[PDB]
Symmetry: C5
Subunit: 331 residues, 5 copies
């Protein structure tokens, strides 16, 4: 019965409008993040979705209790009757606190007056990407934490636990990406309305080439290899050799144009676009070679036979040399 009256004494005459230490020193909010998952990474909408346990820790002397030598875990609905920091994710596209079975919210009071406030949030944050080196690229995605209305005079942010404040980054299971590094940053960003406290979480994503080797690289190598079958077919076979030319020239064009439609409409040329343009030149030259052989074999059969003979070794050699130059330059 003592503990019942105590909680009621705390909130008696409590004004939510006023932050703790209202006219005095700034309230120091300690942030802690446990990353549950990186649900998705989109190049098309140049963003990523993250689910986390967002924990905030500050003192409110108005909530201090003398009698009880225990930490009080109160039903989450009490958060609607308390002052809480106006923390927001500056680079947020859409966010939400999970609400089944209850609001995924936690309030834990300490006799000191300190509050532990937990929220389970799913956030889709913006991540502008440079796809020049795609698919052999690294992306830096961040989560920008800030106060919406309170300046550095009223509110101060800090990572509670220092470099060990954010957890669960190593248990992230992204199939196409691998978290290579993550960094915590504390700043005070100056604006027209004053200086604001800022926390910053950043991770560096490294793309896994596997999918691209199987989807784009192997189909391009095979189309180029299929273009070389023509040099072993009799030059009398005009339809067969032109059919091989047309087929491999168009299939390359569609491999390049298709891949471009799977990504956002960027105006620059990607690493994979350089490879495919190379492959186009090699399959277009095989067809020009037949056109040239077809144009000369009547008057110069020996020369025509020779051009097909040389094409059989020059083309595979030059393509191996192109792959060697390309893959060494990018790695």
């Amino acid at each position: 019965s003592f503990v019942k009256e105590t909680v009621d004494k705390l909130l008696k005459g409590y004004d939510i409008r006023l932050r703790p230490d209202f006219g005095g020193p700034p309230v120091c909010v300690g942030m802690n993040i446990d990353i549950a998952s990186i649900d998705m990474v989109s190049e098309v909408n140049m963003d990523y979705t993250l689910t986390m346990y967002f924990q905030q820790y500050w003192r409110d002397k108005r909530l201090a209790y003398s009698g009880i030598p225990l930490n009080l875990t109160l039903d989450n609905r009490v958060a609607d009757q308390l002052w809480v920091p106006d923390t927001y994710f500056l680079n947020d596209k859409k966010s939400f606190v999970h609400g089944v079975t209850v609001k995924n919210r936690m309030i834990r009071l300490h006799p000191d007056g300190t509050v532990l406030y937990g929220l389970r949030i799913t956030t889709t944050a913006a991540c502008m990407m440079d796809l020049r080196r795609y698919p052999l690229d690294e992306q830096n995605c961040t989560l920008e934490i800030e106060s919406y209305g309170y300046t550095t005079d009223d509110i101060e942010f800090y990572w509670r636990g220092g470099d060990k404040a954010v957890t669960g980054v190593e248990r992230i299971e992204l199939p196409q990406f691998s978290i290579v590094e993550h960094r915590l940053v504390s700043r005070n960003v100056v604006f027209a309305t004053g200086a604001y406290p800022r926390l910053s979480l950043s991770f560096r994503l490294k793309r896994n080439i596997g999918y691209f080797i199987l989807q784009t690289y192997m189909p391009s190598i095979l189309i180029t290899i299929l273009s070389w079958v023509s040099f072993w077919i009799n030059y009398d076979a005009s339809a067969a050799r032109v059919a091989l030319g047309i087929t491999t020239v168009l299939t390359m064009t569609t491999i390049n144009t298709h891949l471009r439609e799977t990504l956002p409409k960027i105006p620059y040329v990607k690493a994979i676009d350089m490879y495919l343009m190379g492959c186009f030149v090699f399959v277009f030259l095989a067809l020009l070679e037949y056109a040239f052989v077809n144009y000369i074999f009547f008057s110069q059969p020996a020369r025509a036979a020779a051009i097909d003979r040389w094409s059989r070794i020059v083309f595979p050699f030059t393509f191996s040399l192109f792959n060697l130059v390309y893959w060494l330059y990018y790695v």
Copy 2:
């Protein structure tokens, strides 16, 4: 009156009224003492969907929680009180949440699909109808001859093992409706209930765990990918029976079967999430590519030699007619035995 008229609505009203007078929702039952024991019960209405692309699944269920709140015990009435669901907003309830939940919701037509039943001893029966999209990370190395394990992780959001304790009410028979699941592409092979106490920085937390073992039905894949592969490979063999004078015809069969094979593999890969490994089906489709590419190389070779060596060329076409179907049957036999 030690026993009161159950039909006296005025006595029930004033009884329920004194129960909630001075009741603090902030405080859990037995606030400073032993933990409150919540008994969980799930009746699975359906497994609405299973997505490989977003590596998740969706289930609809009747989620029931059971606990005793002595503050809600009543002496007069010899009946269990079914109160209008809106009373749940005036009572303390466990902060139960699904740890691996992506999106969830309680159904709200015609009213919130929730139920409160009070018992004279103070026990509360609390029901909710939830739809949950939960994460299910999948290993598609053996796809489409694979099995997946999908779970539902139940936990307390703010209360530690010192304040709340979870248990499956009914033991192994706590979760029902699993046998009534109608999934067209999957079959529930087994399900397991688990009770734990997961340790974290903020303390030990009670955890209940529901698990399924989903087995994929090969039927769709046989008709969509396997039979079209077998037919394109059979198509590539028609070339060996066509006169080697027919350069366009035989190269057209080669090109057609070689490209169709490439598109069967690349298409299937786009229907799934961008995984970097090679699936069971990819091994089969790569095999079929090698068989359809060799038939074209065989014509290239025959075309290259039939002027100077017509007998040899005729023989290579003669042998290809038996070697190719034999080796493909042997490949099918090795693949299907290895994977089953």
Copy 3:
């Protein structure tokens, strides 16, 4: 002024927590449905969307009024101050009450104490479908109405108007389906927590073949006729006759694989698949016929000429016979 003091005295001391006749006989709720539309029927998500006027009728003696000889239509917000049945659709996926300009909700009180409670709901209900006979199939879709918390001891459901309780089923405008029949059912489903009242609405949907004749059947018949043009072309024409073979054999494969992707991933074989597999055998045999003629015309020109001669009559005859057997068996 009298009618104003009347409504106030009705809700004074009213306990919303308690159902009418709280400790006595069950309250009898009379359900009535006007179907505004069957907005959609999905095979892919095996469900259907329906919009309706859902009306419930029950008597609450606490709401009886003596003076007024009129039925009182009160502003819908009064429903938040009254007890209402906890009616829910057991097989719904998502549902909602329309909210513009106000909640599409209606409360009509009767001097008796009877309440008429109306709601305009859009419901996406589950409808598991058997597509073995697709597209010559009939589907049975239902709407399962139940009490969420009250057992048969507290609530009883009934169709108000009997067989004429559900209206607007005959004015349903589905382009691909036709409502052939609908049935109303009353039950008491037994569960662990007790017996529950259940009302059940069912429809029998009949698919319209029209779309399929134009999209799948006619393209199959034409691709099969196209394959017969080969038998009239000179056997010297190896490319032409193999081109017709390849073209018709692949087009057949894509007609079947495409249709399968438009539907959910079922493991069985549909009615349309038996027709399309038939067409595949007919187009594959036309190509084997050319292969056979191409294989023999040097040594046996007369026989080759004869095989082409017979193919011209046997193939159209056997295909007509296949169509006749298929359609008679399925109708």
Copy 4:
């Protein structure tokens, strides 16, 4: 200070449950709509989206004020404390009142006690369409406005401004459609629960052929012209002439099947399907013509040469005649 106390005493003892003139003559609500836009028209989901300023006007004597000779514009939140008509859109699929920065809501009181109530609503309304004449079709789309719970005994609806009640129909910017006409209708629809007031807004949409000429009509003409190139190619060219025949026949079937997938699964034949079927017969006959010429040129070279000579004039002539008959019949 006098105006401050006037508004407070306005709502003193006011019951929102009770409509104005509760036991007497019906309240006359005057509706008036300014259409901001017709955001979209979908054939697939057979509906259209519309954004508008929905204004309602009625007199509530409980809200009359004596002292002030001005019209009072009160903060929109006051609408939650007043009785408002239960107006709803009968053929509505989904609707919403815009909520940024505030609810797009307006309350203007008049000394008389008259209320001007404004709402900015986006509505997706159903529009069942007849696509038999598509894309030379005209569709009639309506907005059905009704009272949800109040009968003609309690509420009466009317268009405030008569034929000039709905504005902004002439400034509608639909790229594929043109508003040809619009009509306002006032009725009293009889139902089981009584007679209800109904306002009806109807507009007649006319489709713009431009897109279809470029997307379907021109590619069909060009594929049919491509089919005629065959008659000028030597009949010795079996592969070339069969390749033109296969190509034109198949691309024609894909033009028809593709267009059908862009629209809802209707079982009937559209105006554009009649044209495309005609085109198919013309491309299929060009191929049969080659089959016939290929079948006879050995024994009858003169006849074969003649059939190709005639095909060069008969086919373009008959196609021009088909276009003339088609376009005249449909316009």
Copy 5:
């Protein structure tokens, strides 16, 4: 302590229904926008999405305080207890105030009685587009700010900071577009219910040709170059030369029809559409040339040989001339 009580007297007997200076001169609301991002630009739904910090400044004498010589930042929930302008975006399709961890809302009181009210809004606004010059086109997209219920007699709007009221336009990272200019406008739009205050923010977007050069222009140039290979192939090669004709003619048709499906169903013809119609004519004429050569080479082999050797120079020349005329006309 004293500050707790001063705010409580401020709101005692305060009527939210009544705007500041009710019945007197119209309240002057000073608008300020900090553009966080232009998230997307859609031609299909002819709209654009924008996220911003929307700030409003007005004076409410009812909220003046004497004791405290400080500006009071109150918990955002106090906005529900104050009068606020009924500001709305006239050309808005869907909008929302961000709500994690709290409503991204800010109230800052000044001893004077002025109020600083901030909101972080994501707005999908309509932008009707003229695609006649697509993809070498400029689009003007606007954000129309208005009062929903209050006339110019009760509310007046103004850009707080003049030409420097809207910030962050230069920091916009659009991959396919570049903000070339932006303009602020103040008006008083007259309607049936009276004159209304209107602020207007306008952007001029310039499309980056890069993507289109790689996706549509280069594949067209490559397909017409492919069509020219036919003139170097022996006229005896009927299948080969007809295969090149059919292939290039159909690929050209799909490049044009595909692009049309990526955009909204407009009835006019775009700048690419006329380039792509030109390429079709070049590519169809190469096939007619073979048909003509195939039709005459028996009786006139010399003439046929000549038509192929002229086609080899006339076609590439004429196509360069088409590109010169088209690209000069469209740069004007």
